Amino acid sequence: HMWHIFERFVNEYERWFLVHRFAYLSELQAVKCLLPEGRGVEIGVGTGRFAVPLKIKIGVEPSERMAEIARKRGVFVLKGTAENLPLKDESFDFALMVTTICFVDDPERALKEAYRILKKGGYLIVGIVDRESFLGREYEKNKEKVFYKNARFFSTEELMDLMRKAGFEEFKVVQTLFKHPSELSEIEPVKEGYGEGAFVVIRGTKK
């Protein structure tokens, strides 16, 4: 269970957000571009770093240590994994996964579960570092060197294919992080598409 790593290095995980604040805000902003109205759930809500600023009230998380931090920050968190969502069929308008699908045990199953819990017309928003980006190449090359040794890296197109095979359609993509996170002194802009920025956000529709 790759997710165990986040229990084990929770303080290191949180540090990232303080050390790389502008990259974090860039990512939030990219997610915020494709976030719809209605009732959302964050799958793999971690310590609430996305749910809290995005005003997502419900989250699912397997790590008790992480869940407790999210709970203190105001998120209502159900214990569970992406592959077995403790949620009813067609009960959400959207679902969000930010740097979660890379650490699930079964990405295909996790996308099927997301499909299940969404209402007709609902949306799945997935954020990833694109394997095929300057930054993706670096993380992958240096994976054997905490979070990524057992991570699975996705290209944007690989992730879309999987989402399409889980039942999603009418994809919309945005991108950000054109500079390295260690050299940001301001928020990075968001643009449509993919191929240029390291962080990509993809929305699919359950029609």
Residue ranges in contact with Na ion by CB under 5 A: 44, 46, 98, 100
Q: In what order do the strands lie in the sheet with 58-61?
A: 76-79, 58-61, 40-43, 92-98, 118-129, 199-205, 169-176, 191-192
Residue nearest to Na ion (CB): 44
CB of 120 to Na ion, least distance (A): 25
CB of 169 to Na ion, least distance (A): 24
Q: In the complex with Na ion, which residue's Cβ is closer, 56 or 118?
A: 56
Torsions phi, psi for 163 (to 5 deg): -60, -40
**Residue 200 pairs with which residues in a beta bridge?**
128, 175
Q: In the complex with Na ion, which residue's Cβ is closer, 59 or 204?
A: 59
CB of 97 to Na ion, least distance (A): 6
What 3-state DSSP class applies to 199?
Answer: strand
Q: In the complex with Na ion, which residue's Cβ is closer, 100 or 133?
A: 100
What 3-state DSSP class applies to 145?
Answer: coil
Q: In the complex with Na ion, which residue's Cβ is closer, 35 or 98?
A: 98
CB of 32 to Na ion, least distance (A): 16
Residue showing tokens 């598409």: 193
**Tokens of residue 162, six digits:** 């999987």
